[PDB]
Structures are given as structure tokens and as C-alpha cells.
Design a protein around this ligand. Sequence first.
Ligand code: HEM
Ligand code: 7W4
Length: 289
Amino acid sequence: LVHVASVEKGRSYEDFQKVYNAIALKLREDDEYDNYIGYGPVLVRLAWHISGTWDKHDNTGGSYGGTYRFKKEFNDPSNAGLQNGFKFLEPIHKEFPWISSGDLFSLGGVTAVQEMQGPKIPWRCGRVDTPEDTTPDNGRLPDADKDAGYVRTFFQRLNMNDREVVALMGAHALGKTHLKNSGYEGGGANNVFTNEFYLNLLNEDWKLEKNDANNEQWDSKSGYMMLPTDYSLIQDPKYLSIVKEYANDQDKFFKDFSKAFEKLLENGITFPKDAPSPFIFKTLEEQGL
Ligand code: HEM
Ligand SMILES: Cc1nc2ccccn2c1N
């Protein structure tokens, strides 16, 4: 199964920078969302869930086809809460109706990471909407109640190795869990992209507690929280080495996250030899906007 990137007709870097800017300006404007976290974290999560359905074995799922717009995928229990991200992006899509849905969802994630002072994420256009019958079934996204071996095996389906997994999970510095969405709660909240996930894992005093949905999670007296799958990264000795590396080197984490996140968002896509190079968008701050 082959998905060839096809540039939206006639479009170039400046067209996509305008879409980036409209997302980024709306991120600034709609600041009250989720007790003033704003929409940055939920857009990152959206970009990960539309990509994380990919299966390397048959090239089903993945960001290319924009299939999150269809009911089956929109209503995945694993996607609860992401409707807020979709609603945020609706007026963007209305203003730029030419961008494909996969390009818009993935660009939302890139824009959010950068606007939250994260690394630059190179981004390529050309995802093409595919029909409703190409929507992957529910159940391809990962469970949070599991251990390191589950996490490792799960991510092999996405062609990610230990380093890529540990780097990606650093996105869990962002946002928060919501009991009504996932059955997890707490850990305060954050809308600045940093390596603090790794510092918190290593430096906090963690207690295994049950939350109000009767699920286990790791809590600290400082009010932070870790999913069982988060905590598994310091229970496994190979993951632990990489956690320590990123806790001690912000720039290395940024560079590895950028590579893994781009790869995540491009899994399943064949880029023609004469496709444009990846775009690196300027932030609003770099533009003086
Ligand atoms: C084993 C892998 C993963 C598991 C089990 C997992 C699970 C979860 C859960 C249960 C939540 C809370 C959702 C809610 O209640 O609203 C969450 C939030 C979040 N996840 Fe993950 N996740 C994983 C990997 C990732 C990856 C790879 C990324 C992106 C690179 C990511 C980005 C986020 C973000 C940004 C949020 C906060 C969303 C918000 O504040 O609305 N996660 N994750
Ligand atoms: C702050 C924070 N953000 C997340 C996202 C996913 C899982 C846990 N998180 C915590 N504690």
C-alpha cells in the first residue's frame, strides 16, 4: 500500500507559513481553554493520535489520509478530548480550505510545539485525503496502564526504537490528564515545552496511588503525576539511561524530539525525489508578529 505525497496545487513555503501563522495567532487568542493551558498541548496530542494509528506491516493508518475527520476514528475512545483540537482547527480550515486534513492536523502539532518554545520541527506538505473506508479501526493507540515491555513492543509497530520512544514521551511535560477523557487525573499543568518530564521522573518522590476512576497512577507530594507507562521509563534500565541523558541535556532532547516527531508525522508517506525540502516555519516571535 503506497501513499505518495502530492503538493497542494501551486502552494509553496509562504502558503504554509500563513497557515502556521493563523494557527499560532489563534493559540495566542484563545488563551482561556483548559484553565488557561490554551490549546497547544491538545494539538500536539491530536497530531500524535492521527499519526499513531500507523502500522508498518501493511501501511494502514498514519497521518496521510486525514481519516480522523470520519466518525469511526473521531469517536475512538482513545481520542476522547481531541474534539477540542478539531474544533480549534475548524476556522483555520475554513480560511485555508485548500490544505488537506492530514496536513492541517500534523501542522497543528508542529505549530503548537514551536509556539510553546519547543524545538523547530521540519514539516513536509502533501498528505492527501483518503475515503472513509480507509479509516483504521479503533484500538491501535497505546494503553496507559502497562509496563516497559508493552511500551517497547507497541512502538515497534510505528518503527520507533528506545531512543525515539523516550524522546517522544517528553511531550508529557505538556498539558495534563483529564479524568473524564482517560481515567487519569492531576499533575498540574504546563504549556511551555521543556525537558521537565525527565527531571520530574528522576527527582520527585513518587507514590503508586489509585485515582477516582480506580486506576493506578504515580503521584508526587509536589502535585505531579506519571502514568504507569511514563514511570516504566525509569523501571527499565535501557529506558532509564536515556531518561537521564535527556534530564541532563536540554538541547539533545530538543534535537532528538524534533527528529522523532517529524518521523512520527511522516510515517507511511512516500515523498517523490523531486518533492520540496522540508519547511522550517518561523515562530510568531521570530516574525515580530
Ligand atoms: C505509551 C504511549 C502514550 C500513552 C499511553 C499516552 C497516554 C496519555 C494519556 C492517558 C493522556 C491524558 C489524555 C487526557 O486525559 O486528556 C495523555 C495526554 C497527552 N499526551 Fe500522551 N500518551 C502516550 C504517548 C504520547 C506521545 C508519543 C505524545 C506526543 C509526542 C503524547 C502527547 C500528549 C500530550 C501533549 C498530552 C496532553 C494533552 C492535553 O493536555 O489535552 N503522548 N497521554
Ligand atoms: C503535566 C502532565 N501532562 C501529561 C500528559 C500525559 C500524561 C501525564 N501528564 C502530566 N502529568
